């Protein structure tokens, strides 16, 4: 393997999407991966369908929470809307 990875712990920028009823982002320095808002997973009907309507085609900035190299997989964690948004 070989290629550049975020960090654990890590506050990055991308740009938020919806797909298989969750919430992942397109993360800008690491476009190749498959970036899962960990917290979207789970998150009950109603709170899930505002953080939806909150969130879609926002740039934003979350922190990594778990990242799978060989599978090309990144879970993170949402955390402040940018000045682009």
Same mark, same amino acid.
């Given at each position: $393997?070989?290629? +550049?990875?975020?960090?654990?712990?890590?506050?990055?920028?991308?740009?938020?999407?919806?797909?298989?009823?969750?919430?992942?982002?397109?993360? $800008?320095?690491?476009?190749? $991966?498959?970036?899962?808002?960990?917290? +979207?997973?789970?998150?009950?009907?109603?709170?899930?369908?505002?953080?939806?309507?909150?969130?879609?085609?926002?740039?934003? %900035?979350?922190?990594?929470?778990?990242?799978?190299?060989? %599978?090309?997989?990144?879970?993170?964690?949402? %955390?402040?809307?940018?000045?682009?948004?």
């Amino acid at each position: $393997f070989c290629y +550049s990875l975020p960090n654990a712990g890590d506050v990055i920028k991308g740009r938020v999407y919806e797909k298989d009823y969750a919430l992942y982002i397109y993360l $800008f320095d690491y476009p190749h $991966f498959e970036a899962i808002l960990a917290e +979207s997973v789970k998150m009950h009907m109603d709170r899930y369908v505002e953080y939806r309507d909150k969130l879609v085609g926002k740039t934003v %900035k979350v922190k990594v929470i778990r990242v799978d190299y060989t %599978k090309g997989y990144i879970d993170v964690n949402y %955390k402040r809307m940018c000045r682009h948004q």
